[PDB]
Amino acid sequence: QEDVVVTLSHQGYVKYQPLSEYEAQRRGGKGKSAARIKEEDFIDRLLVA
DNA sequence: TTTTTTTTTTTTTTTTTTTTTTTTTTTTTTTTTTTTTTTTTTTTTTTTTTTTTTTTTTTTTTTTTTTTTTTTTTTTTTTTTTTTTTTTTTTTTTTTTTTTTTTTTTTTTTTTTTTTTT
DSSP, X not given: OOOOXXXXXXXXXXXXXXXGGGSOOOOTTTOOOOOOOOOSSXXXXXXXX
16 A cells, blocks of 8 residues: 655665554654664665655 | 400499597586574663753844855857667467377296307
8 A cells, every 4th residue: 555654775785664653753852762774884874754 | 166345243442421429618406604583581771750950042233254246258058960778569489279190118927049258
């Protein structure tokens, strides 16, 4: 269907795409949700919603 | 009755070609090795009320160096042409359906003879 989905591409080999509803609201001041996106000595570049 | 001409398949063995046994190179295939996903629990991390002293924005004014500015001549932009690649009509070939025409092979069992090896 059309459902809001996240996508991100990193340096090297990443085109991972999780669903948007897994992450919940937070108050600005805490952050650090620690998403689970394994990366071996590369750098993230892009996120899209 | 003797004697003379010609014709071919064999003594043929050698040249040419064909057939049949061979083994280098790019395309398969089984193994080990490294990327993925789901649970336990676990100290550990992390979400949310209360108080607090803070440190940056908004009253007001100042200037100067980036915002005004006009103009010459470049040079990226656009035009035409042609080549290279992509992609889709067109054609060809092959396979399956069900009644017809044709064929071809592998082994037991015993007993006797050829046909090679020692």
